[PDB]
Amino acid sequence: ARPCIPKSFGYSSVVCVCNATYCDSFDPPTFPALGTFSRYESTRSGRRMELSMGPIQANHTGTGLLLTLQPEQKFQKVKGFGGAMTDAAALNILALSPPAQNLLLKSYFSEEGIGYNIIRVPMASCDFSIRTYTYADTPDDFQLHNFSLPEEDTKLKIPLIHRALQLAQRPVSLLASPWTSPTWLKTNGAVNGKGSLKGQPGDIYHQTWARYFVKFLDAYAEHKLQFWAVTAENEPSAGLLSGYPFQCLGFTPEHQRDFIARDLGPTLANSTHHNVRLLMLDDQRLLLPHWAKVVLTDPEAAKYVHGIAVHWYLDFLAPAKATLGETHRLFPNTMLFASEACVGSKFWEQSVRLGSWDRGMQYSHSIITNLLYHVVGWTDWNLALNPEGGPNWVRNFVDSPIIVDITKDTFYKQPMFYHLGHFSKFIPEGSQRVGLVASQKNDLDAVALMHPDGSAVVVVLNRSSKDVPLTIKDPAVGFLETISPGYSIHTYLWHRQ
Ligand SMILES: *[C@@H]1O[C@H](CO)[C@@H](O[C@@H]2O[C@H](CO)[C@@H](O)[C@H](O)[C@H]2NC(C)=O)[C@H](O)[C@H]1NC(C)=O
Numbered sequence: 001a002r003p004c005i006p007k008s009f010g011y012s013s014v015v016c017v018c019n020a021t022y023c024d025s026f027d028p029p030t031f032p033a034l035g036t037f038s039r040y041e042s043t044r045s046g047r048r049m050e051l052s053m054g055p056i057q058a059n060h061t062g063t064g065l066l067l068t069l070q071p072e073q074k075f076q077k078v079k080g081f082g083g084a085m086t087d088a089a090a091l092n093i094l095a096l097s098p099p100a101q102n103l104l105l106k107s108y109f110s111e112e113g114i115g116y117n118i119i120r121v122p123m124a125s126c127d128f129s130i131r132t133y134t135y136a137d138t139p140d141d142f143q144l145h146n147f148s149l150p151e152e153d154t155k156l157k158i159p160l161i162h163r164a165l166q167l168a169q170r171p172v173s174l175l176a177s178p179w180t181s182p183t184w185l186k187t188n189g190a191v192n193g194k195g196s197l198k199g200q201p202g203d204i205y206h207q208t209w210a211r212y213f214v215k216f217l218d219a220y221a222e223h224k225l226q227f228w229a230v231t232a233e234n235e236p237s238a239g240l241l242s243g244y245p246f247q248c249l250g251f252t253p254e255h256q257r258d259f260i261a262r263d264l265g266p267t268l269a270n271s272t273h274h275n276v277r278l279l280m281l282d283d284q285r286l287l288l289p290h291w292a293k294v295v296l297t298d299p300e301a302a303k304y305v306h307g308i309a310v311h312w313y314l315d316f317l318a319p320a321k322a323t324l325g326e327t328h329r330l331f332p333n334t335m336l337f338a339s340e341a342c343v344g345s346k347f348w349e350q351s352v353r354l355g356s357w358d359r360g361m362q363y364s365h366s367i368i369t370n371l372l373y374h375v376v377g378w379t380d381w382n383l384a385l386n387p388e389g390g391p392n393w394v395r396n397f398v399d400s401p402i403i404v405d406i407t408k409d410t411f412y413k414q415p416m417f418y419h420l421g422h423f424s425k426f427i428p429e430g431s432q433r434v435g436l437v438a439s440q441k442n443d444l445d446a447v448a449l450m451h452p453d454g455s456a457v458v459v460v461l462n463r464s465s466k467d468v469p470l471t472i473k474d475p476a477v478g479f480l481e482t483i484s485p486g487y488s489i490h491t492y493l494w495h496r497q
């Protein structure tokens, strides 16, 4: 329906300017005819998920790369795609005028948007908050009588989460992560820095913390929200580092292992929220496979663990094979999930680069790498940030797919937003990743998946400058002649039957 209004801010590509009355949206997706394929193209030069269509022919004209689909080779089923409703995001969204707010939300969750179906919810404060707080700051309330939701939840997060779902065509799954416990449950009695829960698993500190989760879930239920899953702790490894600057709670693997086994596991199960799934790690992939060895080879722990959460920040220091691959090998029936699918940094680039194609490309390349190694879903970090990368009470380091310029009642959609869309929009929950055999070494990044209605979706990412002539063969249907233009991402969709 509405094309992208491009703006340049001096970087490799454009953002799409959206404001109170105008934002680029899609039409309902169409189920086109057998022999016909759909193409959604985004390019550094400035095309944004542009829809074209073509023929799948029964003869093969090319001499180039041949990506051959292999519907038989079957891998993981997709849980979904989303982002985090952090204090900072909630705060930027809420700073736009209501009409603008909806264009933003529709952008992510509506079928006119990119159809997100996951939302991560931090449990109380983290670095993307304007203040350090937990849901029970009153010291030595082991019973948690004073536990309650701040205005952050009742006025910012919960209202938007409702609106997100209202707007969403898919059913959306909520995931919660805690950053810190009340500081009185902690060994160092501070929201950050090195320090864990006091005593050890089974004890009153651990039982309380376990109960916190249930209270947290209880509270969101009163506001008519269910969670699909929680993570045992966000970045547990961080709470082990001397003078770590933001909200954290250290667990070593063994510590997490026992906390899950003795406390969180049972208490959750023993609650009305027993159906909520527990995900472990929720940390850097480099800590795998070890972390999984330690938690999952203990039966009493692993009976409680539905999957392993991972982060993207530190991936350059761990390849996928050695981490996610080896972990899947060892633990095939424990799904791997990316709960903090974020980056967009360096030492020398600022937090937010308005219209950087490069970060867009990192995102999609990361999602593909993920999918090729059995990962079932993704949660980007903040749904929205300001132009400074804020607000962050410690220090703004990350980008976000949407940037809110509060003074102008307008928001900007980064290349990233479209790089996630090339997936989030066309790979609903249930989709299964299938085989896709390249005929020769090449510079592209490609993944194939099968929509629950039996039809096909292939994302092709050209991270190089050169156009790469391309042929996708589907033995049930024929051949897609195409080119993958340098610095582009393409989603190809077709019926198979
Ligand atoms: C929100 O964005 C839209 C689109 O960029 C702005 O409307 C455009 O205004 C320019 C210049 O006045 C025209 O070239 C276009 O025809 C308009 N777009 C339309 C009508 O589709 C709009 O001004 C923005 N809202 C505010 C308050 O600035």
Ligand SMILES: *[C@@H]1O[C@H](CO)[C@@H](O)[C@H](O)[C@H]1NC(C)=O
Pocket: 138, 146
């Ligand atoms: C709950 O929290 C406050 C902190 O404002 C504390 O002083 C109060 O006594 C607490 N509990 C009860 C039973 O009122």
